[PDB]
Design a binder for these strands. Structure first.
Lengths: 143, 136, 78, 56, 93, 100
RNA sequence: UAACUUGGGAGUCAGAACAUGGGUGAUAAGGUCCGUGUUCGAAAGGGAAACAGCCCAGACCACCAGCUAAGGUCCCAAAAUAUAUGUUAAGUGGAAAAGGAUGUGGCGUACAGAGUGACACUGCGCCGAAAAUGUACCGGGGCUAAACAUAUUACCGAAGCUGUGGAUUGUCCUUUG
């Protein structure tokens, strides 16, 4: 047995700044998901977090295809009888653009105690100004 | 009310109904015909309804032929009875039709009055149809 | 609310009992039938109930006897 | 010593008549091979189970 | 202008006959007097119209292997549902 | 420096002065083994490729010959009155690399 | 590579689903009664989201070794956001009919001044389409190709096969190997 194992004494996490200006929603969330999980590092370990931090700017300028701006709706239940609400994807982009990308990427992560910790390394903004300049974020191009 | 005058057995087996038509695939009496494209059972009451409508439109213009005959009967059980205790009783007579058979042939009219008398009669039948002429 | 049918008789095991080209003995049954659907041949006898049996030892031979008629014969092996 | 036949697919789920033809050729388990010369009766067995073996 | 022709060699499989009909070419057999039994191939459309002029019993003058033989149509096969000729028999007197 | 050696159907990454555990070999205690098949010679020095570097053997020294810790194999099927119990100890050979 | 004969000891007589040839019923039933094959029963492992009977395949034991089957390769989740040529705009794909429509492709036969009509056989779509705790028939996110058709070239993928080391039973029967 000689397989390597990563611990919290040799892991390095960096900060990225991705831009969502003119990008497809589903095809952009699938790439950010692998970064938050650390699927791009050669020292990947399953039982420990090894991903990095990601910052999404220009979220309000995401793109859809076809008529999905009206046919795609989001439901939610309040646990009360008959308490089911709804909202269309087109109306949500115009009010809460950050919750649109935040929930689209959270659904591509595992629903475990470690997956909830990896989903907090994400930051989404509707403009181009982020307050995390101290973290020294580095630009990233989608593949 | 087409029905055979007598039969040897009144309780028969039902036909296969799977496959293609055996014979009667051409027009040999009139100038036009109605060809079937699907499989289904045709009852005497359906044949009656489908030929009275054709006769009315043509206004006694020419001859009409019926190339099918309900030779086979079918039985049915009473209402709210359990399984078994013998076979049912005769209910009606049907005929088997498969893709490629002619049902009606008319003559003595033009090609336009004949294409409208067969369309009003093809809606009374439970099978799809088609217009066919004497093949050259 | 009843049935008038439901009767039948036991099945008889009719048909051929030996194959063509096979060796048999002097008293081997070769064909059970009703009437004469196959006629006896050389060294063959017809029983009381139309059963065909051999009379010597030899090979069996099913051959044709006229237009639309069949027979069975037995020839000694040399 | 002219043909080489190897069993690729298993015999589970096959009719008993086909399982008996795989025994006359001399095949025990999956991926097992055997060498025989091309005979008139040899090719009559492969043709019956040509969907299970791979003659080379 | 006499129509063209092709010679079917050997024995075709069910699939070969079906694909030949799909292309637009119908098989035929000529067994008339003065000729042998040869399998031929003729375009379906090319035959449909040349038969228009000569009619039912007119002379086809089909050419087999560089040798034109005067012939006539004896019998053919027709599909009423799909309206596609299947087989043609040429008889040479 | 290091090398990949094939011994018992597996491959290993060995350095000079390291302990390893492989399948039971033929040599007895205190003898000297020699790895004929070397697949890769790594490090910053001159490396080589494949399939197998002709030569460049490895030398080791046999230290111990024992049996791994006991393993218990148990299986059963519910409602069928069928069970089975087994024991197992896998033998091994402990070596020590001398020079690549 | 079996078969047959003689003798000692048994168990079994409630069966099930799928494919297929039929009777019965209503060309209803996870219905019922027979012919034929397979699986379960008495069978783990991989696939079908979960799912004795469906597809692939039959576990002697150990290993942080390799190649494959069914089924797969955007993320959950191991492997192509592969290549070539075409079709569909409906979320079709990811539930249904009779009928109704210059929706859009392919292959064949003077009309209000150089473009208009009429048919046959066929691809992929549309309307017809209304149930009761909550999205509620893609497993979820999501997707316009990550859908469909015709091919090519890689890879992932079982307790199947192979490699290595050990158990028990055999057949080997001429240097206990």
């Amino acid at each position: 047995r000689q397989t390597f194992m990563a611990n919290e004494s040799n892991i390095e996490r960096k900060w990225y700044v991705i831009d969502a200006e003119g990008q497809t929603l589903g095809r952009l969330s699938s790439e950010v998901a692998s970064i938050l999980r650390g699927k791009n590092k050669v020292t990947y370990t399953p039982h420990v977090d090894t991903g990095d931090y990601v910052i999404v700017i220009n979220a309000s300028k995401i793109e859809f295809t076809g008529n999905k701006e009206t046919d795609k709706v989001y439901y939610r239940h309040s646990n009360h009888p008959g308490g089911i609400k709804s909202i269309t994807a087109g109306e949500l982009r115009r009010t809460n653009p950050e919750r649109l990308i935040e929930n689209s990427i959270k659904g591509m992560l595992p629903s475990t105690r470690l997956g909830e910790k990896q989903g907090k390394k994400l930051f989404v903004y509707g403009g181009a100004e982020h307050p995390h300049a101290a973290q020294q974020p580095e630009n990233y191009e989608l593949r | 009310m087409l029905l055979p005058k007598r039969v040897k057995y009144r309780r028969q087996h039902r036909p296969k109904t799977t496959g293609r038509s055996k014979g009667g695939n051409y027009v040999t009496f009139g100038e036009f015909g109605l060809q079937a494209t699907t499989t289904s059972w045709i009852t005497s009451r359906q044949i009656e309804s489908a030929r009275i409508a054709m006769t009315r439109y043509m206004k006694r213009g020419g001859k009409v032929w019926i190339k099918i005959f309900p030779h086979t009967p079918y039985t049915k059980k009473p209402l709210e009875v359990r399984m078994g205790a013998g076979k049912g009783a005769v209910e009606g007579w049907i005929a088997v039709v498969k893709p490629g058979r002619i049902l009606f042939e008319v003559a003595g009219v033009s090609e336009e009055v004949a294409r409208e008398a067969l369309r009003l009669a093809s809606h009374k039948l439970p099978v799809k149809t088609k217009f066919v002429k004497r093949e050259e | 609310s009843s049935t008038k049918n439901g009767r039948d008789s036991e099945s008889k095991r009719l048909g051929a009992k030996r194959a063509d080209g096979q060796f048999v003995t002097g008293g081997s049954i070769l064909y059970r039938q009703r009437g004469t659907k196959i006629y006896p041949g050389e060294n063959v006898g017809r029983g009381g109930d139309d059963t065909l049996f051999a009379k010597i030892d030899g090979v069996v031979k099913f051959e044709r006897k006229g237009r639309d008629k069949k027979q069975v014969s037995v020839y000694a092996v040399a | 010593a002219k043909l080489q036949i190897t069993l690729t697919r298993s015999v589970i789920g096959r009719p008993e008549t086909q399982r008996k033809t795989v025994e006359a050729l001399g095949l025990k388990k999956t991926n097992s091979s055997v060498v025989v010369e091309d005979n008139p009766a040899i090719r009559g067995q492969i043709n019956k189970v040509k969907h299970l073996v791979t003659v080379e | 202008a006499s129509l063209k022709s092709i010679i079917r060699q050997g024995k075709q499989t069910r699939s070969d006959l079906k694909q030949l009909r799909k292309s637009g070419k119908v098989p035929a057999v000529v067994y008339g007097y003065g000729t042998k039994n040869v399998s031929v191939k003729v375009d379906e459309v090319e035959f449909i119209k040349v038969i228009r002029e000569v009619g039912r019993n007119g002379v086809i003058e089909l050419g087999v292997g560089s040798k034109t033989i005067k012939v006539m149509v004896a019998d053919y096969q027709f599909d009423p549902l799909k309206n596609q000729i299947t087989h043609i028999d040429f008889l040479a007197i | 420096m290091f090398a990949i050696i094939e011994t018992g159907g597996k491959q290993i990454k060995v350095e000079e002065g390291q302990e390893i555990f492989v399948e039971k070999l033929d040599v007895n205690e205190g003898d000297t083994f020699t790895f004929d098949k070397v697949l890769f010679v790594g490090g910053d020095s001159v490396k080589v490729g494949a399939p197998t570097v002709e030569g460049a053997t490895v030398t080791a020294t046999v230290n111990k010959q024992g049996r791994g810790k006991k393993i218990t194999v148990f299986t059963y099927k519910r409602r069928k009155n069928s069970k089975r119990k087994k024991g197992h100890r896998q033998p091994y050979t402990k070596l020590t690399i001398d020079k690549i």
